[PDB]
């Protein structure tokens, strides 16, 4: 732990990237977090909303 600054910067960058990756798969109030399932399951008006 003699290089705590560089390790901390790398950890913060990795944590931000992982948080974005996790947030990629959030429902956000929709019926599903997978776009392909919505498109292959739901009609174009409701699919587009």
């Amino acid at each position: 732990s003699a290089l705590g600054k560089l390790q901390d910067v790398v950890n913060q960058n990795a944590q931000a990237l992982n948080t974005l990756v996790k947030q990629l798969s959030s429902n956000f109030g929709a019926i599903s977090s997978v776009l392909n399932d919505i498109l292959s399951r739901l009609d174009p008006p409701e699919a587009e909303v």
Binding site: S40, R41, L42, D43, E46
Partner: protein, 50 residues
């Protein structure tokens, strides 16, 4: 059966063809959500409750 004792049926392990039901035109109301009225031929799930 009555509305308070509605007949419950389980459908699985077979093949469902909703195209004939949609094209029958003998149903007054065909209303639904979560799935489009069409595009039921390429979709399937675990079980069906009627």
């Amino acid at each position: 059966a009555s509305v308070y004792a509605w007949n419950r049926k389980r459908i699985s392990n077979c093949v469902a063809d909703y195209s004939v039901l949609y094209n029958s035109a003998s149903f007054s109301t065909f209303k639904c959500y979560g799935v489009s009225p069409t595009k039921l031929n390429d979709l399937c799930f675990t079980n069906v409750y009627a």
